[PDB]
Structure formats: C-alpha cells, structure tokens
Amino acid sequence: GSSGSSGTGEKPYRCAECGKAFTDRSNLFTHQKIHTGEKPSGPSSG
Ligand SMILES: [Zn+2]
C-alpha cells in the first residue's frame, strides 16, 4: 500500500518501541523512560 512514516515530520531519531519522532537524542532517551519502566510483554501469552 501507499504507507510510509516520512511525512508528518522528518526527525533524525525514532523510537523503535512506539514510533515517535525526536529532534535530539537527549529527548528520545528521556521518552524511552516510559518504555524501560513497565512490565514486559509476550506473544499470544498473558
Ligand atoms: Zn516510544
């Protein structure tokens, strides 16, 4: 399909967890906090 990320915004960094865009790393890491601070997940389990 005509899908794609590049559009709404062109940021150098990107969150491989959710998919957020950031201008500077410091910002990205600061966000990852909400990612590296919650119970883990599992495939078709729990
Ligand atoms: Zn994220």
Curated annotation (Swiss-Prot):
Zinc finger (C2H2-type): 13-35
Transmembrane segments: none
Compartments reported by the entry: Nucleus
Primary role: May be involved in transcriptional regulation.
Family of the protein in this entry: Belongs to the krueppel C2H2-type zinc-finger protein family.
Designated name of the protein: Zinc finger protein 484
Protein source organism: Homo sapiens (Human)
